[PDB]
Amino acid sequence: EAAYSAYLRRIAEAYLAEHPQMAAPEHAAHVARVVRSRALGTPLSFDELMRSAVPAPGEVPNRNSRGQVAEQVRAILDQYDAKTEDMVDDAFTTEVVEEAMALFGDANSVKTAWRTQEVLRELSYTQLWALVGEGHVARVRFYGPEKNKVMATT
């Protein structure tokens, strides 16, 4: 229970040196409040509080597997086979950028991804539990001859 004391001391030093002085003889209750808050954990804002753990289905980006990267390379290497002012600022070589995205990139640089957009964008049990605890699920309907599956309406 002395570790608590040294811990709160460290949090005090942290806030005192982090925010430029401002500690002073005044604001002592404010210092105690921020010490308690940073000791317990991270103070969330309201937007961070209502942020769902479950991402939106549109928020999951595509990540190609190696075979789909091969399909992309084949498509890009197949495809193809005015005053400078009005020319758009994005006037680069489309084929070169597409092929330099099929290599490296973000959708093509995992080398382990397998149905990254089909798995995900799909509720699992833990994500359904998080959505229900956040009050985001309107109705749960048990179906099947065994009643081990639900059709959750959010």
Binding site: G58, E59, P61, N62, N64, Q72, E98, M101, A102, G105, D106, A107, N108
Partner: peptide, 28 residues
């Protein structure tokens, strides 16, 4: 809507699918 804004949306959807097949595009 009409024909022109039925061709524009079709082209935009085609490019959206091309972007999804290549990039970290969203809601596709």
């Amino acid at each position: 809507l009409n024909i022109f804004s039925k061709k524009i949306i079709s082209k935009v959807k085609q490019k959206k699918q091309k972007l999804n097949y290549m990039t970290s595009y969203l809601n596709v």
